[PDB]
Each structure stands twice: as structure tokens, then as C-alpha cells.
């Protein structure tokens, strides 16, 4: 299979179920809204060793927000409900309630399940909290240094997907990295999705467990490490490839992960030096969500 | 005291003791280094509910790096040795070892005490790791998708200070925010320091524990909340002040904290609308380090 | 008349006729496309002393571009046809054909009037040009150091409007500025419009000639200068106002100018400290296009 | 010759004499100072068809400016005195005097040759002009909408150099581009120099006249165009190079150009895929300034 003149292996990505809450952060302008979102979603690449998986989803124009100001929608992910509930409180309470000019609202107003993050954080007012309605949302005003911080009572969450992905293989590292940046920019416009790794790009890659150091939970996936292909049997790196990068995608549903994957691949293949596009899986075992690349075009 | 025509209260900031590790991250250019530093230092405003207090210290020119590539020094802070070693492994292992083009070196080559974070993280190579020396530093090469990740064997840490600060009072919110942003920019050029909060700015402010909710580790500092000055008897908000913002500073030592405080105030007072400058403190024997504002100007 | 609680004067803006060309610039990703668009539209705030009035209109998603890669649409304006053709060849030839990874396409495909800028610039190939069709567009490939620069044969231009506007009055300079920045951000999502001044904001403001220096083509509009209200008898500055900022808007048609004016004001009035909103005119004796604030809300 | 393992041809760069004025622009913070500098330095890549060659030189810290505010130093270049005098009036009067919060000062106080830019632009005040002294500099306050614009009345200039350069050849377009990017970032820290092309990088390149279209004053240097190497018959592009990027350097003196050239090359050779490093000249006849690469290392 070829896409934009680039070879795309007819294989699949294997994803997993995960809980995801969608939050809307607004501010004076996009800069301040972003300052808060970025801080609240850092240290959030993988649940392997990060408190959660998080990222900025998409910008929100004044015409679409409750208070009529510019903002950003962000996603915070965790394997368990209580875990996600815990992440929302810590991240929004330590990184957004404390950020300049911010106000937070529910990013999934029609969600089945929701947690009372607003009700809990408002206790920060130590008794001076007030109740207010902003564009129809029921909120709380928390008096503090800059003025009144406004936060909706609840935040909705849903059963999403984590681990959507695709690999980019190229002739040099720069070519692979530029293809990966293109993919991330392209994916940034896709609603309902995020790319949690640094800059949204994975430079490491991984395999469950290890072959030598059994005391590890995950190690380098030597079969996709170009610098040691001569030393690895059954290596998946072609003779002309010197570098590989992966794009990991978390999303509210399968259709969104699928669109993100197509959009990302389409853009990546525009960069000279790209040799091959494929994706990572676990042989059909472990995963519950499978994305077949040949079904994307 | 008067600085640039503005009223500065002759009081003090009450800082606390904290462990600080200094890490140098390099990459192709400033953008890629920043991407790694940014991800690794997020969700790190306060130890009250964040896994640590982190932030970008200063830009590192190629002329000053072991590999001759552009980079950034970052600081990761924690109250104890185990937690810091812990945060170093998690943030660097999940946010820097995974980010494109990066290499990590000891940001405090000197310093007696250090953690062997490099030695532990190299196990990720599962036996394919190799020793290599870069710019006179003992590092490890970890094969992965992008190529080889280079990391020094050890990272140094020292007894630093967290909690240096000053408050900015203005006639309107935008005026207080503009001065706060001006302070953050000026402080960015100061070596050995970081401003942990979002955008480096504190919009909330906190006090003892709580009046009504003793189940809170901290609550709003109502005495500095202009929106409720009326129903507050010991309010520290002068009549015409409608907004306040705080700047928290963490750093390697007192001289650095004092420099950052001085530089931030000088810049803050250039903004129209600023009426008063002060600092926050508590019980004498509660915070070890005191920073008297009257000794900085 | 009040908007969001802020008073809006029931007056009008007086704009003028101008020629406008719309160009699409694409690259590896948004950064590189922005690099070219930013350089090409610089030194272009006003026709009084700049070679032209220009600016970045809006983002162009990969799904909307002829080549499927990210980009930005920009507008370049001039009073005459000859002057506009000249500015297209100079700005695109010197600032886009020379920038990394770009390609340029016709941003107004259905316009009847066009300039053959592509045809002229391709001579730079000195005999090595080659014709190529991209996404249905007739183009030329120009080999140079980086590879081949792709540029459509021509660019469409239309009769647009310059000078759409509104003034923002506030209690402090930071308040008026934050409001203006809020409006610029909101207006950045509006199609068919550009905000030509630095950061899209007018900090000066001007009037036809000059009372004391008749050799000037324009001078400060004293009736709107806060700092000297006590020395100007016809001052239009209310008592509590210390700073004013203007937002100038150029665009393809009246409906666009109108939408931008409306969205800008809505955003601006969300900033604390804003006291009044109005607009600039010249008695209706100069501009053909009048924008009544009354009809926007 | 080898630098960081990369082959560096033992040739030279051939530069020319040009008039350069240095201007300091300050604002509330680095963001606002940048907005004005950016706008004022755009549409300025080459005097061939641009009004001038301009760019941002280096950041200016509060401790270094006359008003104690953050800012940026920019360079505006022109071949003649009067052309330079005019470019200062237009760019600064149209792009800085109009940008939010700015103040301008002389960037070369010790230069005997100076232009009275400030004295002429203050006529904008139409009589309400007022003299003020800031940090020892003699300036003018010009009343306007945002308040009072402060500008020193004189701006110095000197006989500088235009055309410093070196070429980066790589196996892929992304490889050469990342190399040139790194070089620009590395040069941004060098005092007294600027990189005038888009993002500071030249993707085109050129030769004096033309081989086929003689009415042209310049055209593609086909001997350095990778895409037509099989054709040229005089190509200077080695078999394995697919793309080339050039970095043009302008500066106050020779020492500075050399430092910038050295700094750029060193950083560029750090990027994987770079094959060769050389520079552009004209047989040593056209330009007066020669920079031999072999004497920089
Ligand atoms: K807040
Ligand atoms: K997205
Ligand atoms: K993240
Ligand atoms: K890495
Ligand atoms: K710092
Ligand atoms: K932080
Ligand atoms: K180009
Ligand atoms: K727009
Ligand atoms: K412009
Ligand atoms: K100004
Ligand atoms: K420089
Ligand atoms: K330039």
C-alpha cells in the first residue's frame, strides 16, 4: 500500500481502554489560556511512570465558550475512575486555579458520568465561595489574589482510547523528526484527540518487559532501534533507515483515533526522506482496540 | 521604601528548605531542548499537591555544553532525597529520554552529593547500552527508535530554597498581570533560579491551613483578596487596589533568591497602575530563610 | 448602548477603498509557513509610509491546501493596481521564494482579476523551470539550493476595504492593552480580515494633516490623547480614562469588516478596566464605507 | 579540513560594505519589545528588491537599557547614508512609534556618525511634543492614544558588512534545514550580527546575472541546485547531497562576522546527515571582505 508515494505497511495499531475527562480553560486571550493548559498537562506522557496521560486538544473560540472568552480544551487520562478523579483535582487545583485570568468549565457537558471537581476545589475559598451562572453553566466564584476564580461544578469524563499510533521511518534523523512534527501539527486540528508525548512525539519506543533485565516493566524495543539493527535478529529496520519516530494518540472514541491517524500519516508523507510508515501492536493480545492502516485510505 | 516611584513595603518573604537537582538538557536547537524541558517540568507548581516543584532555569549556549549543542538547565525540587531521586527518574525517564534529539548531562558538575539517575535509566537499553564520554563527562548510550540517547551517569543536587517571593498590587487586574509578566521575564535571565508557577505567576495565594475547613492543607489568603476586603477585618488590601499577583521563586541559594527578588521588583514597577509591592511571610520559626526587601534596594 | 456592561458610543468608523491580493503559503508545518508569511507581511502597517499594508489572515489546514501541507493565507494591500503587482513580486520574490520549504498558491481562486506573479518570478530559474499541476493548480517548479520552489502561475486580487476600526478606552494602559490584545486574538479567527499594525494594535492613532506642521501627511490625534487632555479643548477623552488603543481592520468586503469589528469589541469588553468603546471617522466626507456600531449589536 | 567530523572546504566567503544603524526598542516585557522589532525588521531580506536589510540582533536585559525595561537591539542596513536615514524614519515611525508600550534609544551611543531620527519623528506631536531625559539619553515624549512615546533624538550608524555566509550540504532537505536552524539559533546569541533572511535562512541562493534571461539582474545559481545536478554539467553538488541551505550574516565588523560564521558552522555540524560545509564568493573581485573558513578553526 502506498500513500502520497510512500510505502505504508498493511499492519495495525493496538490500543487500550482508558478514562478521559475533557476540560475547557478560558482566559483573557489564547496566550494566558495556553499558559494554564500547558502547565496542567505536563509530566503526562505515559501512565507507565507519569501521574496520568494528558495534553491540549484544541483551541476554543470566544463564540463557543460559556463566558465568551478565548480558550483551550485539554484531556486528562487515567486507567481508573478514582485515579482520574484524583488527577483532575491536583492538576486543575495546582496548575489552573493558580494560573492568571483562568476560568474552567466542563468540556463534556452531555457526558453520562461526571465528577464534582468544581464543588471540591471551591472549598479553597475557606468560606467566601459564591455561586454563579455563566452562560448557563452552574459555577462557583473562588475569591483570591487576582480576583474571583470561576469554575463549573462538575467535569464530564468518558471511556476513551489510549495508545493509537503509527511509526515513521526515514533516511536520516532530521527527516524522521520533521515528518513527525508535521504529523503533530496536522493532528492538532483534529477534534477529540491529543498527542501526550513531548511535543507530541515519541523518540524512544518500547516493548513490554525485557530480555536481559527481567526486573524491568518495559525496555527499549531493540527490533526498531536502527543503531543496533546489525546486532538484533529479526530486526524490523530496513537497510536504508537510520531513524524512527512514533506518534501516540489518545482520544474520546475510535472514529477520532482513526481520523487522527490518517491526518497524521497524510502530512508525514509530505516530508522528503521518509522511507516507510507502519505501526506498533502486540500481536493482537493485550489490546482491545485495533486500527488497521489499510482501512484508513 | 520607594522603587521607581512605587511604594514597596519594608517587610520580608519567609522561604523554606528544599532539595534541588540541576539538569542540563540539549537537543538540535533551542526549540527541541525547550520541548523536553517544558514537558519534564510541568505539573510542578507546588509540593502541596504536585509531585515536585520544577521549572526552566536558563538557556545554555552551545559554547557552554558538553556536546556543543544548544540547551536548557532545569531545576526539579522535592522536600526529601528519596522523593527527588524519585522525581528525577520519572520526569527524565518519561519526558526527556522520550523526547526527540535530547541528551542529558549533570547541571551541577560540582556538588558532592548526586544520584545515579543515568546508570539506572540506561538499563532501559536491556543490555545494548554502551559507555561513551562526551566533553569529559562519563555517559551512557541507550539505543532506541530515534538513535542513541546520551545521558551522564550522575546528576548533582543541593540544599536549595523554595518560597522566595513578592506580591504585586494594582488598580486593575491587567495592570497587576502586566507587571507580574514583566517580573517573570526579567527573572528568566537570573542564574540559579526558577519561577515554579504557571507562566511563573501566582494568581491565587495561600495561607496557614483554613478557618472553616481544617481538612485542607492550605486555603485562600483572604487578607490579600481584593474582592472581599470589606468582609475581611485584617485585610492587607489598601482601598484603591482591585488585583494582586504573587511571584514565587525557588533556587540554589540565598544570594540567587535575593537577586531574583530585586530584579523582579525593579521590572514590575515599570508598569502603569502598580500601587504597592510587598512579600508574604508567616511564623518566624516556620520558615528558615528570611529575605528582607529593605536590603535589596 | 452597552455591550457586556461596557458603554459603546453610537457612532461610526469611516474606512477607505483599497486593492487586496490574497496569497496562500505552505511549508513542512505551521512554523515554517509562519516564518515566510511573517517576513513577507512585515514593514506593512500603513500606506502613509510603508510599501504596503499586509498581514496574516488565518491558518490553512492541510485538508484545505492544494498540496495537502499546512499553511497560512496572507493579504497584501495597495491603493493602485501597479503598486499591488509590484508589492506581490517584491514581497513574495524576496521573502517567500527564499524561505525554507515553502510553496505559494492563489489565495483567491475565483477572483476575476489576477496578476501573473508566478509567471514572472519563475524566470529566476533561468531556463530550468518546469510546469507542474498541483491539486488542480497550474504551477511552476523553480530549482534552487533547497530543491524546487513551487508557485502558482497567478494570484487573484479584489477591491477591498482598509481602515475598518474601533477605539478602546480604559482606566490604565495595561487594561486598554490587554483588551486590544484580546480583540486581536478574537479577530484572528475571522475569515477575510487582517489587523495590519504591530501585533495588530494601533498605539498611536492619527488625523488628516496637522495644525502646526502642514508638511506632515498625518499627525497625532490630540483629541484622543489621554496624557494631554487638560491642554486640548475639544478632547474626546472621558475623565477617568488614561489610555486608548485602536484596532485597524483591512478586508475583502464590508460583511467581513463588520464581523471583525463586532467580534473584536465583544472580546475587548471582557477585560477589566475598559471604560468606553467608540470609533474613528472624518465626518463621512472622506471614506465611502461607513461602519455603524449601532448595527453590530 | 574537518570540523566535528564534517568536511569543511578550504574556501572563503566574500562580503560587501554596507551602512548599518543599531536601534534599541524596549517595552513592558520581551514579548511586546519583540512585536515592534519583528514588524520593523520584516520585508528586509536583501537590498536587491527590499527597502533594506534588517533583523533582530540580540536581546537587551533590563540592567542594560536606558529605561530599565526589557528590549531588543535591531539592525537596519542600506548601501547609502540617505537611504539609511529614510529607512529609519519609515520603519520606526510606521512600525515602532505605533506599536504598544515601546520606547526607542540609540543603539550605538559611541558612534560619531548619527541620524536625528528622534528629532524628526517627534513632529508627530503637532506641538504637544516635550523634552525628557532618560538614563542620560536626551529624548522626546510624543503624546498619542496609548500615552507618551519616548524616543532619543539621535540614532548612530557605522560602516558594516553585508554578505557573510557559509553553505550547508546534506543528504536530505530536512537534514540541511535542521542544520541551518541550529546555526541560526547559535548565531542569535552572537553580539553585533543579524541573519536577515526568513527565519535567518536562505533556501534559494543566487548568481549575479543569468545565462539565458539576460534582462535579469540575478537568478538561480544552477551549480548549487541539487535537483538539476545530473543536468548542469558544472555542478558543485556532490553525488550524495540532496539539499543546500545558506546562512547570510550582516554585522558591525569583521571580527563579528567571523565569530558568527564559526559559531554557526560548529552548531550545524552537530546535525545528522550533514555532508559538507563551504561558502559563497565571487572570485575575490566583487566584494571587499573575505572570510576564509580555514582560519576560523
Ligand atoms: K485563576
Ligand atoms: K487535537
Ligand atoms: K503531555
Ligand atoms: K531522547
Ligand atoms: K531564571
Ligand atoms: K512548573
Ligand atoms: K522556497
Ligand atoms: K483574521
Ligand atoms: K503588518
Ligand atoms: K509606541
Ligand atoms: K545575533
Ligand atoms: K529580515
From Swiss-Prot, chains A, B, C, D:
Major location (coarse): cytoplasm
EC number: 2.3.1.101
Subcellular location as annotated: Cytoplasm
UniProt xrefs under InterPro entries: ForMFR_H4MPT_ForTrfase, ForMFR_H4MPT_ForTrfase_C, ForMFR_H4MPT_ForTrfase_fd-like, ForMFR_H4MPT_ForTrfase_N
Keywords assigned: Acyltransferase, Cytoplasm, One-carbon metabolism, Transferase
Assembly with partners or alone: Homotetramer.
Entry function: Catalyzes the transfer of a formyl group from 5-formyl tetrahydromethanopterin (5-formyl-H(4)MPT) to methanofuran (MFR) to produce formylmethanofuran (formyl-MFR) and tetrahydromethanopterin (H(4)MPT).
Family per record: Belongs to the FTR family.
Protein name (record): Formylmethanofuran--tetrahydromethanopterin formyltransferase
Origin species: Archaeoglobus fulgidus (strain ATCC 49558 / DSM 4304 / JCM 9628 / NBRC 100126 / VC-16)
Amino acid at each position: 500500500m502506498k500513500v502520497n508515494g510512500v510505502e505504508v505497511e498493511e499492519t495495525f495499531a493496538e490500543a487500550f481502554d482508558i478514562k478521559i475527562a475533557r476540560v475547557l480553560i478560558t482566559g483573557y486571550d489564547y496566550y494566558w489560556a495556553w499558559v494554564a493548559a500547558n502547565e496542567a498537562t505536563g509530566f503526562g506522557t505515559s501512565v507507565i511512570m507519569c501521574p496520568a496521560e494528558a495534553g491540549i486538544e484544541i483551541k476554543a473560540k470566544p463564540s463557543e465558550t460559556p463566558d465568551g472568552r478565548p480558550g483551550y480544551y485539554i484531556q486528562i487520562c487515567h486507567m481508573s475512575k478514582k485515579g482520574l478523579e484524583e488527577q483532575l483535582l491536583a492538576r486543575l487545583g495546582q496548575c489552573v486555579l493558580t494560573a492568571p485570568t483562568t476560568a474552567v468549565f466542563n468540556g463534556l457537558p452531555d457526558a453520562e458520568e461526571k465528577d464534582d471537581t468544581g464543588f471540591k476545589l471551591k472549598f479553597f475559598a475557606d468560606g467566601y465561595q459564591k455561586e454563579v451562572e455563566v452562560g448557563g453553566r452552574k459555577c462557583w466564584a473562588v475569591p483570591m489574589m487576582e480576583g474571583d476564580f470561576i469554575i463549573e461544578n462538575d467535569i464530564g469524563y468518558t471511556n476513551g482510547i489510549a495508545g493509537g499510533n503509527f511509526f515513521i521511518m526515514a533516511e536520516t534523523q532530521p527527516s524522521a523528526l520533521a515528518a513527525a512534527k508535521a504529523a503533530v501539527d496536522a493532528i492538532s486540528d483534529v477534534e477529540g484527540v491529543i498527542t501526550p508525548f513531548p511535543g507530541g512525539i515519541v523518540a524512544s519506543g518500547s516493548k513490554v518487559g525485557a530480555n536481559k533485565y527481567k526486573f524491568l516493566k518495559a525496555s527499549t524495543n531493540e527490533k526498531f532501534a536502527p543503531s543496533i539493527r546489525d546486532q538484533v535478529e529479526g530486526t524490523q529496520i530496513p537497510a536504508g533507515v537510520k531513524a524512527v519516530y512514533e506518534i501516540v494518540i489518545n482520544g474520546l472514541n475510535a472514529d477520532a483515533i482513526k481520523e487522527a491517524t490518517r491526518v497524521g500519516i497524510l502530512a508525514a508523507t509530505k516530508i522528503p526522506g521518509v522511507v516507510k510508515i507502519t505501526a506498533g501492536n502486540y500481536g493482537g493480545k493485550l489490546g482491545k482496540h485495533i486500527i488497521n492502516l489499510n482501512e484508513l485510505f
